[PDB]
Amino acid sequence: HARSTGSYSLVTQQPLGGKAQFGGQRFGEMEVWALEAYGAAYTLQEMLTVKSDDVNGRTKMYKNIVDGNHQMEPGMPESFNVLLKEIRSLGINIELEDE
Amino acid sequence: FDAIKIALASPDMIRSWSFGEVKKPETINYRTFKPERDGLFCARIFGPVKDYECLCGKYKRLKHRGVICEKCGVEVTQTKVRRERMGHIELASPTAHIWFLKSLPSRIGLLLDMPLRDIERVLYFESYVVIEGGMTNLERQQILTEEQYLDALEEFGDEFDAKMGAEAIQALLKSMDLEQECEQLREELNETNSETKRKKLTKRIKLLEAFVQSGNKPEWMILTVLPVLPPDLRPLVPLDGGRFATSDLNDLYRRVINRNNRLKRLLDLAAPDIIVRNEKRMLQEAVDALLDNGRRGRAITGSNKRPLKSLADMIKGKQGRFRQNLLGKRVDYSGRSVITVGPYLRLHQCGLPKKMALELFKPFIYGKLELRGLATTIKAAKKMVEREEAVVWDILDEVIREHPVLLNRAPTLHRLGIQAFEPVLIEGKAIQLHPLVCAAYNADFDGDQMAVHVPLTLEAQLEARALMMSTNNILSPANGEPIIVPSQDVVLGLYYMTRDCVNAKGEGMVLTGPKEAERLYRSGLASLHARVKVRITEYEKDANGELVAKTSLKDTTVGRAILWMIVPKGLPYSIVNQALGKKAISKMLNTCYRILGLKPTVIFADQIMYTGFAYAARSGASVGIDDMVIPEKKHEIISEAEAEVAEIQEQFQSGLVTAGERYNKVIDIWAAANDRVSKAMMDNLQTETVINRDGQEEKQVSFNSIYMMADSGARGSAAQIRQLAGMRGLMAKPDGSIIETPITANFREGLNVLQYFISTHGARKGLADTALKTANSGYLTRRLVDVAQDLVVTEDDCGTHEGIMMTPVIEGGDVKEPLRDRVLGRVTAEDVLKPGTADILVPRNTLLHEQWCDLLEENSVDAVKVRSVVSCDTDFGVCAHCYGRDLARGHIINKGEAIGVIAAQSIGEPGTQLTMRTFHIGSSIQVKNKGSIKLSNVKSVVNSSGKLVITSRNTELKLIDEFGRTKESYKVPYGAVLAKGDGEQVAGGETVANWDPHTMITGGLPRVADLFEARRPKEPAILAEISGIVSFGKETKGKRRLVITPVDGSDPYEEMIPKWRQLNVFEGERVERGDVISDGPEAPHDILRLRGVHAVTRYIVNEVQDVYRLQGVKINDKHIEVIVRQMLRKATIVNAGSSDGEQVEYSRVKIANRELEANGKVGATYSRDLLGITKASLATESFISAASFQETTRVLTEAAVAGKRDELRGLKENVIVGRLIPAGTGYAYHQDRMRRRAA
Amino acid sequence: TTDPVRMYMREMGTVELLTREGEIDIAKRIEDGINQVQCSVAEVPKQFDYLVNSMRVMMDRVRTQERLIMKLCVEQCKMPKKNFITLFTGNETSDTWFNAAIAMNKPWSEKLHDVSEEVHRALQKLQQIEEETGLTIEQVKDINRRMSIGEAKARRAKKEMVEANLRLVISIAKKYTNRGLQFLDLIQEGNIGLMKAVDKFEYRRGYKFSTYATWWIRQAITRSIADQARTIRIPVHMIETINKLNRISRQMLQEMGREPTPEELAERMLMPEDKIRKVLKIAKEPISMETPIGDDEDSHLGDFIEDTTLELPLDSATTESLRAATHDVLAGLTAREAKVLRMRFGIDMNTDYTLEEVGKQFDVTRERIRQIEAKALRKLRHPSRSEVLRSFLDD
DNA sequence: AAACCTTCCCATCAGGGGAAGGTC
DNA sequence: GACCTTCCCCTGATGGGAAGGTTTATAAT
Ligand SMILES: [Mg+2]
Ligand SMILES: [Zn+2]
Ligand SMILES: [Zn+2]
């Protein structure tokens, strides 16, 4: 099975594991460590930013690819903003600074 | 942004986020399904259900966006805002936050230094508590029950306030003056001794001052307003078919709202206490279950015995958010399939199915088709690729050309689990994999599956070619040996070629060159094993790096001459004149790489494979039932041992021998008989083939198929053969570990039911051990990567001569690993001199590549002080020099290369090859090799016999051979029999060591886990604290007493020991610090404290290397050294120096103390503190990184009260927010970006 | 034990039960308090409560003037509290007590002159009440005091009354436990009905309070279930209908052998048949997104849910390409036609405009515009100008 | 569960008008 | 040419109805 661009999960924007051939392959912590062992910053970033999260980055990268331009404008992974909302849902206040 | 901060949430700051108040626990209508007013899904509080559309429908378009329709109070905007809009519920009565109460270090608990139990009692409305007593009979804080409070109000109606419940705890936190209380504890720590006065005081003061530093207020521990989560974070989305799907968060919030509303109603309704107190407790229960369910009662969802998942459960754990989402995600542009062999591939390419290529590269194909006028618009290209038009196939060829793809094996033990290849379009649905890489992936073609990833950006396409390329990674990082090596058929074909047999057709003839050898074999005239001698032209570059070819005739075979054609130009042809099995196809490859380089070696390996496969194919190399020849002697040997056991049987039945004596007897005789049988078949195999030389018999090494497979190393070893053609030893139970009735049969004869059943016993423990070990090895390697990540090569040089002394591991008689292997690739700490003192063999510091290793090996040298990572003058990282060299590339390590992760991987990948249990089995000394006795650190004396006797416990026995190297190391106890002395000349084994017998872990993988965790052994040995004669104590009171007796100055130190523990130290003898008064297993803390950092960093490596040496695993000490460095990163000050028992990071103590010591001020003395891997990882500057790995709740709570801040300064926290990690390419980018920042 | 349900079950044991004299005499204490209130009214509970609140309003009106004059004459003038109470007690009607306090001639006596102006009018407010309520400013206070005493008697007696019979609430609530509502919720919703029963019980009817409290608590628990059980709240009568349908289908099990035909319930029930299927389609309850999935694995129902609001990028790229194509195409026509098309449609503009809307600022009104559009669309209808755009329409 | 009653919201019906059609 | 009856659109007028609330007395802990 193979997949280029399929559907995504509702609460957290990540390609679904189904159903079932069109699920995106899993990139666990071990594969992230493998990408860290080699010095491969852009591969890892595009792996966890453009290809799974970053609701805007997916569309940006797709349009660029179809235009012959291979460049990524990485944004914030949606799961991280969800995490910020969940932490803030407690008596905890977690924010971000200047820019 | 550039940082993240966490702090307490004040009620007003809570309302700030909220855009509306939730009043009713409703979600949708049940017939319209629209969001009810003030419900959890209210479109007025949060936002519209539909994009750019109003709930009432009056406002419908992008024409007007910013407006709040007076109809329904909805503002028409993007519906995605329901993902970001929060809300709030106004709690009728205050409610405490569970984390600030139930967490191990209870915030409110030691914030007022009240006990947790009493706060819990007060919250349940089971007692009162006083607040702000002033001039009262009672204190400002106290507890009293119903009757006590009953008649207490009449005493003082005013000036005496005692509440009950959460309001009481809040008010106690509010009127509390933190500065006033703090300003006392300080003095309570100064005057009064008795650490009980210092147990919680020294931590309570920290808590107070950090609370003041953060700026947050204590009253916020009790939640006045309850924040709510946006609706899209807990959707009620319709699950089709039909039924709805909600989040347990919704049920929890519904309960909370119901209870708060009932409390309000009762308040207005004027109900008595018991009712409202029960309601308050219900509300507290609902809130605590909504925040962190399970700590109190585990509320359950309806229609299930399953508890409803709360907020905190959506963050912590392997499942949940941190591990399962932020650190790892499912990824687009990827695929999966079954891998199979295509050998025709080059090392840099792999066969990729066309069906997968079409789907993966879909956007590239669309764009390329639209570029060349082949498609009007993007939709047309979509439809074309959907129609399977021929024109697109060429386009595919155009877009895949020179576009690397990442191949990944399911389990990723080390970085080689992912490698990039050049796609080669193929039909079918199977992925073609290169054989040489199978060793790196640890993947067989038995059905294993692999995944593929397509790099998107140009930068990723470059990283898949210069860094992760299959050809750019050949030799492993854990050890210099190449991981790309011919495995089974290659080495078999080469061994068949290089083999020689006397009397082969054309033997002894001569040929013009290798071409004629090939032409002679392929024509059927000459064989491939003839002993022919031919002319070959070998190339040797010499005396200025100038190639000079050499022509001559050599003693060789036809097959070796044919194999010489593949060898690159620079090799000497002495590499090709031998049996040519696997073990030195490996060394041939290694020498080719370290002589000619990467480019020749790649094609060399490709050619080795290409030739070995075809030659093993045309050789036949089959296996028949007759190939396994049993020894005819086996019958007699078996019968002899079988009879031998009958004497033992008669021995025990009488009582002449005990049961255990007879069992050991039988087992020993059977093991010896097994030795005999295996030896018989081996002698009948190795020299089996005998033929006529020039017409007369002669015996040579055999051509037997299975034996050739054993000898070449392509497949099963000798232990397999012993069971193939002889009695297959004797089996072992799970424990008991050996049975008396061995397996007489060999696999060829066939087993009978009983012996097979006996074998299954040992078979099960083997199978089972692999499965459950898979789970624990992951845990080990994960902890290892967790303790190491942020450590990166950051500096060029540290400038320290410290290093560590590298000496060969000469244990017992011979050496386990020479010094070249423990020194190669590293840098000298100081100038090694020739054995003649005062000279220079190597400069101050230089990278010792193979040439310096050879130079050292020639000169008599077993002493080289090597710079190590543990001892290095670098802060927040390691410098390239002290670390040394290592990579797939053999040069000095680059800068910015994250070595901690690769070291954790180098230690974790072999962790799966270990075992869970060891179950070992097995007196003057006899020197083996001719040399000279050299004693080390021994005090002796002469006695009646006239010879020498040892007076010291520690005495090493070295051997200075005719060369001058030390290959012998033996320890002799007190009162030995010395025949020669120190600096004598021994014969070929003269015995100079004699004494008396008496005078009178698991281990494996769990062992490795124990060593890296610094776990105290069961029965520890204790260590002397200072030099001096030891002194005894009063008597046996409980255990015993032991008085330290320093010789000269301060001599008050002491300790207490149990008399049940035997003693070993001498009574009236001097004993230096770090000596064994008691035999036993040592602990890392004790070694570190009583010996030093280098002693303990050597102990850890030497001990953890034994378990890996037992199993065939070889890893350079460098990774273990980096781990050890990461362990002892903490330390504790002693004298408080210029500025403030404390524990801090070593680097910070230096940055604060050494810079001021320069400034002429007072120095600060620290004490190295040793921590396990998990404990050292528990302490980290970044709170995000710590909260990701373990204990999310506790870490987040503590960082919240601390108001701590995180600039992410690291790897894990960067991948969490999806940024360039600060290493490798990320290091190059972060360097430029950070240079311009903060400056 | 730890759970709060235990902190409640064992807390109510301290309050002893009451029967049978206790019921009657505590009810007599309640009625005696309310009868104290009844005489105080002289000088259906729905109007009675307004009468009570009106007395309370009168006392608040008087106390307002009291505290105003007090702040004026003590805080703003520094007269001792005793010199205020002694002179103010007894009249509370006229200004005779102010001039005397002026004549006192103490230091504060001068500041009275200034607050005399501000107190005179406050006193007229206070005195007028006498001509309204036909009472003196003192009798109002006394009546309110006695009636507050009556309220206190009723309060103590009623709290004791509910505390005594608390156990019956649990006795009733244990029957309903498993209806998607927690246990303490049930017992509390029953206590509410117990209070409502206490306030509406005549001890003289001779019946035992158990029956009335039982009825009220049963209602307060069942209706509360209907209200707070389902995540999607349902009208109260619909829960009754659902329960009736389920009861009938349960009773007919042994009759039909296995289960009843759906058309029968419309017969057995009063309702026509077409609504029964809607009532059964409505009853579906939400499934937790944490529900384990096939293979009993970690995967849950909250995972297999895609997001369908999103538009796949394959279509957004086509949207941008159509944008560019129509941008290049509209430039091929004239400027008049270009503006007309970008006006009638929202192309490159804030919003679309209607016929007269476009004609307003184009100097020639409706029909002219109608002739341009139909012409331009005709000029673009022609191939060799519509191919690149025709590639976008596929059906 | 039934029993009679009140507030609010429908989506449709009696009523009005402004003219409209047809004719001794 | 008017008169008598006819053919269609806004104010609201409302019977209709769904959603909501208050009672129910044997005794019943
Ligand atoms: Mg396999
Ligand atoms: Zn609106
Ligand atoms: Zn260094």
Q: Where are the alpha helices (H) located in B897-1031, listed in sequence order? A: 899-908, 1005-1012
Chain D footprint positions (protein CB, under 7 Å): 1-2
List CB contacts (< 8 A) between C4 and chain B. 124, 278, 281-282, 284-285
B1118: helix, coil or strand?
helix
Taking alpha carbons only, the member of A88, A87, A79 closest to residue A54 is: A79
The span from the CA of B181 to the CA of B179, in Å, is 6
Would the CB atoms of C317 and A66 count as touching at under 8 Å? yes
B879: tokens are 């410098």
Instruction: Evaluate whether C351 touches B59 at the Cβ level (below 8 Å).
Output: no
Q: Please state whether strand D lies within 7 Å of residue C244 at its CB atom.
A: yes
Closest residue to E18 by CA to C1' distance? C235
- In the 8-state DSSP scheme, what is residue B325? I
List CB contacts (< 8 A) between B308 and chain C. 288, 290
The span from the CA of C91 to the CA of C138, in Å, is 9
Residue with tokens 């156990």: C167
B807: alpha, beta or left? (left if phi > 0; alpha if psi -120 to 50): beta
**A98 exposed, middle or buried (CB, 10 Å; 0-12, 13-18, 19+)?**
exposed
The span from the CA of B591 to the CA of C15, in Å, is 94
The span from the CA of B44 to the CA of B20, in Å, is 8
How is C104-151 classified by DSSP, letter by letter? T--TTHHHHHHHHHHHHHHHHHHHHHHHHHSS-HHHHHHHHHHHHHHH
The span from the CA of C229 to the CA of C223, in Å, is 10
Flag whether residue A2 sits within 8 Å of chain B, measured between CB atoms.
yes
Taking alpha carbons only, the member of C316, A55, A47, A64 closest to residue B334 is: A47
Q: Determination method here?
A: X-ray
The span from the CA of C231 to the CA of B764, in Å, is 52
Would the CB atoms of A5 and C313 count as touching at under 8 Å? yes
Chain centre distance of CA B589: 29
Would the CB atoms of B282 and C185 count as touching at under 8 Å? yes
List CB contacts (< 8 A) between B61 and chain C. 351
CATH number at residue B714: 1.10.132.30
Instruction: Evaluate whether B478 touches B597 at the Cβ level (below 8 Å).
Output: no
The span from the CA of B478 to the CA of B170, in Å, is 57
Is there a cis peptide before residue A20, judged by omega within 30 degrees of 0?
yes
Name the residue among A35, A80, A88 with its Cβ closest to that of B17.
Answer: A88
List CB contacts (< 8 A) between B455 and chain A. 43, 46
The span from the CA of B701 to the CA of B990, in Å, is 38
Would the CB atoms of A58 and C320 count as touching at under 8 Å? no
B1026: tokens are 């200072």
B353: tokens are 């199915």
The radius of gyration computed from the CA coordinates of chain C, to the nearest angstrom, equals: 40
What order do you get walking across the sheet with B1166-1169 strand by strand?
B1143-1145, B1130-1133, B1166-1169
Angle at B28 between CA B27 and CA B31, to 5 degrees: 155
The span from the CA of B1159 to the CA of B1161, in Å, is 6
How is B1039-1055 classified by DSSP, letter by letter? S--EE---SSS----EE
Chain centre distance of CA C365: 55
Any residues with CB less than 8 A from the CB of B1175 and at least 6 apart, and which? B1013, B1014
Q: How many CB atoms lie within 10 A of CB B629?
A: 17
Would the CB atoms of C307 and A19 count as touching at under 8 Å? no
Domain membership of residue B739 as a residue range: 632-766
- In the 8-state DSSP scheme, what is residue B83? G
Distance in angstroms between the alpha carbons of the first and the last residue of chain B: 17
> Which chains share 3+ C-beta pairs under 8 angstroms with A?
B, C
- In the 8-state DSSP scheme, what is residue B245? E
Instruction: Evaluate whether A23 touches A15 at the Cβ level (below 8 Å).
Output: yes
Hey, which residues 76-95 in chain B have their CB within 8 Å of chain A? Answer: 83-84, 86
The chain B residue lying nearest C324, using CA atoms, is B377
Residues annotated within a binding site of B for Mg(2+)? 444, 446, 448
Question: At B433, which helix (H) or strand (E)?
Answer: strand B431-433
C325: tokens are 């194509």
Q: How many CB atoms lie within 10 A of CB C237?
A: 9
Q: Which nucleotide is at minimal CA–C1' distance from C241?
A: D1
The chain A residue lying nearest B408, using CA atoms, is A31
Q: How many CB atoms lie within 10 A of CB B535?
A: 15
Would the CB atoms of C289 and B248 count as touching at under 8 Å? yes
User: CA of B1189 vs C1' of E15, distance in Å?
Assistant: 69
Q: Side-chain half-sphere of B1201: how many Cα atoms within 13 Å? A: 26
Angle at B365 between CA B360 and CA B369, to 5 degrees: 170
B1180: tokens are 């980290």
Is there a cis peptide before residue B241, judged by omega within 30 degrees of 0?
yes
B874: tokens are 């670098």
Q: Please state whether strand D lies within 7 Å of residue C222 at its CB atom.
A: yes
The span from the CA of B2 to the CA of B952, in Å, is 63
The span from the CA of B738 to the CA of C339, in Å, is 96
C137: tokens are 């400013």
Beta bridge partners of B246: C288
Could you give phi then psi for residue B899, rounded to 5 degrees? -85, -20
Any residues with CB less than 8 A from the CB of B373 and at least 6 apart, and which? none
The span from the CA of B959 to the CA of B355, in Å, is 68
CA distance A43 to chain B (A): 5
Q: Where are the alpha helices (H) located in B151-247, listed in sequence order? A: 166-174, 178-190, 196-199, 201-214
